[PDB]
Amino acid sequence: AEKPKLHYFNARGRMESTRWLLAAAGVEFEEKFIKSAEDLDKLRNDGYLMFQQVPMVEIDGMKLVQTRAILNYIASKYNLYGKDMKERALIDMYSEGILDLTEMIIQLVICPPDQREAKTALAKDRTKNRYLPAFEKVLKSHGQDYLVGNRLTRVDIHLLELLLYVEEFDASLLTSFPLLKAFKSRISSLPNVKKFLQPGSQRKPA
Amino acid sequence: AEKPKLHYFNARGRMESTRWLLAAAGVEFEEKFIKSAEDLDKLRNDGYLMFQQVPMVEIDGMKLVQTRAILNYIASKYNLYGKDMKERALIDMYSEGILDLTEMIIQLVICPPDQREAKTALAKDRTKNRYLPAFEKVLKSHGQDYLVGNRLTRVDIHLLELLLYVEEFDASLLTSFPLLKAFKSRISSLPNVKKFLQPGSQRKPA
Ligand SMILES: [Cl-]
Numbered sequence: 001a002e003k004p005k006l007h008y009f010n011a012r013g014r015m016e017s018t019r020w021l022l023a024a025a026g027v028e029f030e031e032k033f034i035k036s037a038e039d040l041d042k043l044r045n046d047g048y049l050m051f052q053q054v055p056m057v058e059i060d061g062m063k064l065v066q067t068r069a070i071l072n073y074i075a076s077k078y079n080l081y082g083k084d085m086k087e088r089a090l091i092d093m094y095s096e097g098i099l100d101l102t103e104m105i106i107q108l109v110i111c112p113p114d115q116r117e118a119k120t121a122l123a124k125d126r127t128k129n130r131y132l133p134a135f136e137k138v139l140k141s142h143g144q145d146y147l148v149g150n151r152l153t154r155v156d157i158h159l160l161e162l163l164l165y166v167e168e169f170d171a172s173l174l175t176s177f178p179l180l181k182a183f184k185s186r187i188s189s190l191p192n193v194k195k196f197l198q199p200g201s202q203r204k205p206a
Numbered sequence: 207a208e209k210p211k212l213h214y215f216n217a218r219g220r221m222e223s224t225r226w227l228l229a230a231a232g233v234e235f236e237e238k239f240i241k242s243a244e245d246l247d248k249l250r251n252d253g254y255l256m257f258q259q260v261p262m263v264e265i266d267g268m269k270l271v272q273t274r275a276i277l278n279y280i281a282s283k284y285n286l287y288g289k290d291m292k293e294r295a296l297i298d299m300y301s302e303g304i305l306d307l308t309e310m311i312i313q314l315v316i317c318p319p320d321q322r323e324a325k326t327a328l329a330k331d332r333t334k335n336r337y338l339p340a341f342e343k344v345l346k347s348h349g350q351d352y353l354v355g356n357r358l359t360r361v362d363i364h365l366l367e368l369l370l371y372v373e374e375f376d377a378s379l380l381t382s383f384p385l386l387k388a389f390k391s392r393i394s395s396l397p398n399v400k401k402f403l404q405p406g407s408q409r410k411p412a
Pocket residue numbers: 068069072092274278
């Protein structure tokens with residue numbers, strides 16, 4: 001199938017950034033949900049999971065695991081990875097910061113309830129004082145609609161996804177970043193993104 | 207300077223994989239060690255650290271942070287990232303597995319002493335039963351000297367580095383993987399790698 005096939009639980013988890021990037025690229029995709037231990041064991045026994053873990057994406061004859069490998073391939077394939085290696089260096093630097101903050105926020109519910117408060121205060125401080133200032137500064141410096149190269153790249157999508165999660169986590173964290181507010185509304189208005197934001201899409205709930 | 211400039215503590219930590227890749231590529235580099243809080247604050251105040259953290263590498267007019275961004279740029283620049291995006295997909299999938307295991311092993315000393323035993327047993331199980339079998343299988347399947355494309359790529363260097371750390375951590379973990387033993391000796395014998403393995407190089411101690 002030329003539709004990529006996404007193997008994961010029926011949940012956001014580690015697959016959601018790949019759903020976002022495919023949706024932004026206008027690429028229809030199929031999901032095969034892991035609903036049982038037998039589902040996972042079959043993928044493992046069939047040799048489909050190089051390190052016995054999901055996300056796995058079947059695409060272009062490959063069985064790709066590791067979300068960073070999956071995202072890199074999708075971004076290159078659909079021209080969302082910039083035009084040269086210096087542009088990719090900016091995209092990667094920006095993207096890695098976003099993934100680090102996203103990981104901290106996701107880790108809050110996997111962490112035991114008695115440490116969730118302490119890691120929540122830390123995640124909020126890092127959001128307000130380390131990560132969002134860096135991206136506000138990028139947008140303020142060049143004044144362009146997109147993070148890199150004055151055109152849509154993968155990291156605009158990664159940032160929108162993060163901004164949506166911040167709004168779920170604590171909407172007040174966004175109030176002091178006006179260029180990021182405007183960015184969120186702009187990227188949300190891209191036709192493929194608008195479609196993915198609508199109820200009924202493959203976007204997964206919190 | 208066309209020598210890249212590596213900003214970090216005088217320690218392996220998160221900079222060592224970049225030292226390895228530059229050394230394997232035959233690229234002379236300069237180190238500027240953070241020896242004081244003033245050193246770090248200056249980098250931060252001067253706007254050199256996008257997310258206020260090191261590693262940072264000055265290269266080709268850029269101030270690159272996030273080790274994955276740094277490594278991606280160095281690999282592309284010095285032709286250690288394969289020849290097409292499908293080859294990069296394999297390189298990335300392999301590399302991400304290696305980084306995940308390396309992180310677990312590094313985390314053992316940062317973790318408090320009273321949990322080091324439990325995470326050590328887990329790291330050893332993952333080494334023996336998840337990660338090293340995957341790479342033994344890659345080498346066994348194609349029987350070639352290198353992981354990807356039958357030529358040296360970044361991930362051969364990442365794997366050698368991991369194999370050296372496994373040998374420090376618990377040398378018995380390697381005994382059942384004969385193709386990985388042979389791989390370690392082969393990659394160690396590359397002229398640029400031999401040089402980096404010699405006492406007196408910029409390779410950092412444990
Ligand atoms: Cl990457």
